[PDB]
Amino acid sequence: GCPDGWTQFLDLCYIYQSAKASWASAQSSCQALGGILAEPDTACENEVLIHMCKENGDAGSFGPWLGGQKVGGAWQWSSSGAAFDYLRWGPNEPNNSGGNEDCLHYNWLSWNDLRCHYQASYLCQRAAE
Ligand SMILES: CC(=O)N[C@@H]1[C@@H](O)[C@H](O[C@@H]2O[C@H](CO)[C@@H](O[C@@H]3O[C@H](CO[C@H]4O[C@H](CO)[C@@H](O)[C@H](O)[C@@H]4O[C@@H]4O[C@H](CO)[C@@H](O)[C@H](O)[C@H]4NC(C)=O)[C@@H](O)[C@H](O[C@H]4O[C@H](CO)[C@@H](O)[C@H](O)[C@@H]4O[C@@H]4O[C@H](CO)[C@@H](O)[C@H](O)[C@H]4NC(C)=O)[C@@H]3O)[C@H](O)[C@H]2NC(C)=O)[C@@H](CO)O[C@H]1O
Ligand SMILES: [Ca+2]
Numbered sequence: 001g002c003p004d005g006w007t008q009f010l011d012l013c014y015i016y017q018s019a020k021a022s023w024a025s026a027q028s029s030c031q032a033l034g035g036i037l038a039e040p041d042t043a044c045e046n047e048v049l050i051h052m053c054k055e056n057g058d059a060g061s062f063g064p065w066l067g068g069q070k071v072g073g074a075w076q077w078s079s080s081g082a083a084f085d086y087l088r089w090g091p092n093e094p095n096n097s098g099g100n101e102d103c104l105h106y107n108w109l110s111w112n113d114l115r116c117h118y119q120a121s122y123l124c125q126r127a128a129e
Contacts, residue, residue, distance in 0.1 A: 001129040009048045011128050014038055016056045016064065018121045023103040026065045026122035027078070035126030037067030039077045046088050049123055050109050058121055059109055065122040068104030070094075070113065075104075087111070 002013030013035075021029060023037070030036050040046040049066075053059055067078045075084045075094070090110030094101065101113035105120055114120075 003126075006126075007048065007052055008128060009045060012045070013126050013128050014049060014052065015124050016052045016058070016121065017124065018056065018058075020119035021065070021122055022119060023065050023069075023105075023116040026120070027067070029122065030124035033124055033126070035124040036079050037065055038123040038125040039067040039079060040088070041077060041082070041084070041086055043086060043088075049106070052123065053106055053109060056121070058106070061107055062114075062118070062120055063106030063109065065120050066104045066106065066111070067125075068111070069116075070102040 002008040006013040006015045027037050038049055040049050053063055058064055068075060069078050076082055088111045090107055090112055093111060094113035096113060100115050103114055103116040104111055105114050
């Protein structure tokens, strides 16, 4: 079971929220919905979020926040501290442009590193009931 207006995949529920929110603000928003920024650590979870991005007309540059973060030099999922294993970086990413690209988001439907105060839409996940 997933809540109404959310998209189901295996044991997860996702939702796209149109916003102009920093990564931190987006996290706070997902937490109020009982969830977290989406952490697509499998190829198929990414395909589902990508489909949602296309559905919401957010398939180009400065696509939505995801829950990956760069702590020091290490790319990891926020909720778990897990180092990225499966990767979905876009071509020539990550590139750390301007030196402060410490948050994960979709850029042209691929992962990119972006400055965390950039204002974007966001994707949340929660456990299915
Ligand atoms: C109001 C006003 O006038 N404001 C302007 C303000 O717009 C402007 O900011 C610049 O805006 C432009 C236009 O949106 C930006 O250009 C696009 O950037 C996106 C975002 O990704 C880049 O930027 C972020 C940082 O913000 C960074 O995290 C990413 O890594 C990426 O940086 C770039 O990485 C490249 C490798 O990935 C490097 O080689 C670059 O040097 C590096 N850029 C920087 C700034 O360091 C980006 O996605 C866009 O790229 C698409 O479009 C171009 C042109 O068509 C293509 O050449 C690209 O290949 C890419 O196209 C897409 O590529 C996909 C695969 O990658 C394909 O799947 C897609 O189909 C294809 N899509 C299309 C439509 O062809 C742009 O490059 C830019 O970042 C802003 N800043 C700068 C400095 O340019 C500022 C700046 O002057 O001025 C204000 O006045
Ligand atoms: Ca980048």
